[PDB]
Amino acid sequence: MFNNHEIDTILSTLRMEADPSLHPLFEQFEKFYEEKLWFQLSESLTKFFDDAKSTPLRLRLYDNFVSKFYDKINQLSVVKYLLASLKDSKDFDESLKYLDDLKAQFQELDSKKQRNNGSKDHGDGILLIDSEIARTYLLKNDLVKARDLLDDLEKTLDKKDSIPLRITNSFYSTNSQYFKFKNDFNSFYYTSLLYLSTLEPSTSITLAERQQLAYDLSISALLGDKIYNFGELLHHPIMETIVNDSNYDWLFQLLNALTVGDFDKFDSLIKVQISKIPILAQHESFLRQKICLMTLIETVFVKNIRMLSFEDISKATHLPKDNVEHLVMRAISLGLLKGSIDQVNELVTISWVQPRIISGDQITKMKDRLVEWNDQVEKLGKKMEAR
Amino acid sequence: MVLEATVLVIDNSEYSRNGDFPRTRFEAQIDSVEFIFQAKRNSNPENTVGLISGAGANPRVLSTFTAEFGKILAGLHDTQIEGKLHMATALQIAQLTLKHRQNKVQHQRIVAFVCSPISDSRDELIRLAKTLKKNNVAVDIINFGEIEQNTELLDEFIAAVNNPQEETSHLLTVTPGPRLLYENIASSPIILEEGSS
Numbered sequence: 008m009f010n011n012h013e014i015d016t017i018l019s020t021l022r023m024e025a026d027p028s029l030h031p032l033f034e035q036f037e038k039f040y041e042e043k044l045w046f047q048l049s050e051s052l053t054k055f056f057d058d059a060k061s062t063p064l065r066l067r068l069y070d071n072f073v074s075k076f077y078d079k080i081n082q083l084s085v086v087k088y089l090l091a092s093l094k095d096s097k098d099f100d101e102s103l104k105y106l107d108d109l110k111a112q113f114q115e116l117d118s119k120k121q122r123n124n125g126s127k128d129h130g131d132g133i134l135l136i137d138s139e140i141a142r143t144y145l146l147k148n149d150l151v152k153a154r155d156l157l158d159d160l161e162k163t164l165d166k167k168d169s170i171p172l173r174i175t176n177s178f179y180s181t182n183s184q185y186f187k188f189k190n191d192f193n194s195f196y197y198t199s200l201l202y203l204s205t206l207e208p209s210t211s212i213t214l215a216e217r218q219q220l221a222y223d224l225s226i227s228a229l230l231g232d233k234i235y236n237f238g239e240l241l242h243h244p245i246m247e248t249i250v251n252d253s254n255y256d257w258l259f260q261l262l263n264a265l266t267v268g269d270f271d272k273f274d275s276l277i278k279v280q281i282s283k284i285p286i287l288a289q290h291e292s293f294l295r296q297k298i299c300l301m302t303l304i305e306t307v308f309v310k311n312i313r314m315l316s317f318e319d320i321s322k323a324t325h326l327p328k329d330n331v332e333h334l335v336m337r338a339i340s341l342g343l344l345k346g347s348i349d350q351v352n353e354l355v356t357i358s359w360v361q362p363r364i365i366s367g368d369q370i371t372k373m374k375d376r377l378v379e380w381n382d383q384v385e386k387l388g389k390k391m392e393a394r
Numbered sequence: 395m396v397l398e399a400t401v402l403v404i405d406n407s408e409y410s411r412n413g414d415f416p417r418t419r420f421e422a423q424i425d426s427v428e429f430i431f432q433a434k435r436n437s438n439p440e441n442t443v444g445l446i447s448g449a450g451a452n453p454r455v456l457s458t459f460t461a462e463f464g465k466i467l468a469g470l471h472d473t474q475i476e477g478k479l480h481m482a483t484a485l486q487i488a489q490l491t492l493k494h495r496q497n498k499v500q501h502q503r504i505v506a507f508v509c510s511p512i513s514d515s516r517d518e519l520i521r522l523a524k525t526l527k528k529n530n531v532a533v534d535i536i537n538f539g540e541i542e543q544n545t546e547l548l549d550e551f552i553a554a555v556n557n558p559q560e561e562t563s564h565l566l567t568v569t570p571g572p573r574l575l576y577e578n579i580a581s582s583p584i585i586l587e588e589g590s591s
Contacts, residue, residue, distance in 0.1 A: 017542075
């Protein structure tokens with residue numbers, strides 16, 4: 008329609024005295040393709056509030072606007088679009104043609120300063136094209152050539168960074184797709200946590216990217232044995248932003264299967280469309296080993312005695328004494344517990360390592376314990392004054 | 395005419411890079427500060443001009459009162475090029491700045507160049523205008539480029555501080571014609587009716 012004709016002309020009137028980028032023919036072209044209010048391409052500040060309605064296949068005219076765009080606004084504004092806009096269109100062929108013609112510090116750097124690539128708002132094409140090429144071969148070709156150029160991007164971020172997290176979220180988006188195609192869900196679990204923390208403040212806070220991310224958070228939480236099991240799921244509003252059905256209900260069954268321990272819950276917790284992956288076959292017994300063990304630690308704890316026996320663990324895990332020392336020692340070697348197991352006397356000594364999150368039960372209890380320490384020191388302190 | 399303290403408040407916000415002046419208007423204010431510097435320094439034997447940037451960089455100060463233009467012109471290139479303009483907290487920075495001037499007999503005056511209108515409410519400017527009026531602080535407002543897309547939001551700030559031209563409350567409106575930048579504020583009653591140019 009005339010939305011791009013009337014609004015951009017008023018904005019360009021301030022952005023330039025005599026508009027070089029206003030062509031009566033080019034303004035009529037945008038109306039012929041997109042007749043709706045949402046346009047795939049625009050200029051000035053209108054393009055920030057209006058994204059591609061369906062697919063941006065008409066961007067060929069957006070590249071020609073750059074020649075007359077310099078006299079209006081500096082080239083920092085067109086880097087966030089184009090190459091980064093074609094990623095949403097799922098076409099790497101038209102984007103690759105502009106990657107080699109620009110590269111880094113060739114055509115983009117003459118009089119222009121360094122905005123630290125394209126992470127947010129305006130920026131240059133120095134470090135952004137190197138990041139787009141890393142994700143170009145990652146989502147198309149194999150992962151061999153993707154990591155070779157990813158290490159130069161990772162070493163650049165660690166050597167040089169900026170104040171906002173806009174660059175980190177763009178960097179975590181590259182690694183999020185790298186560990187997704189691999190068989191390691193432990194590194195993919197920690198990678199998705201850093202991507203989710205920086206996604207909420209800025210850099211595409213819309214729910215379009217959160218639906219595809221929540222699907223990966225459910226797979227990384229069930230399979231990943233690294234950080235707790237369900238503990239991190241309650242911290243971030245993951246299940247609150249998605250529905251409870253269409254294979255998203257299995258996250259709720261994780262808390263009920265680990266606390267209760269019914270064998271029928273684990274068999275129905277994951278069906279054959281998922282559990283066919285061999286990773287779960289090895290981690291099937293690694294999910295319930297930590298929760299059943301940490302539950303017995305806080306139960307037996309009175310004052311100085313955290314000690315456990317084999318019969319207490321054999322009732323919770325429903326396994327003989329051979330599997331008790333196998334599963335617990337694996338969690339101890341990872342650094343979760345400092346204790347050990349005595350096979351002769353049938354005693355298990357466990358120290359205090361795990362911070363034991365999800366508080367509020369012991370806050371009222373530990374408050375009176377600090378009063379006991381405050382009273383003993385005060386009573387012994389007054390006795391040292393007289394004598 | 396007499397000794398006075400001039401504080402220049404620029405606008406680093408996103409609309410300050412527009413084409414009201416050729417090339418980039420963000421680089422246009424480089425000549426605006428230089429024009430005021432050469433006009434005020436040649437009028438009186440001892441005069442200093444301050445610089446305060448309150449848009450997008452937080453209420454910081456690029457350069458305070460000084461007799462040298464070297465560090466003033468250099469700090470304009472590397473400062474924040476985009477942000478949000480807030481005139482409520484920016485004018486309060488120049489109020490405490492006037493106590494740091496050279497001579498206590500200098501007239502208190504604040505010159506602010508407003509590019510784009512602020513998004514904050516105009517109720518804060520009512521109490522802010524009464525604060526500068528009790529201390530006899532001259533307010534110089536230059537509104538250009540924001541009159542086309544919006545009405546002037548500082549008119550209520552001038553109405554409360556309203557005083558005859560011999561004291562305070564100097565409001566200016568620059569005509570959006572094909573005129574040079576340093577010639578817009580030259581014809582305006584800023585450097586006019588002084589001792590020397």
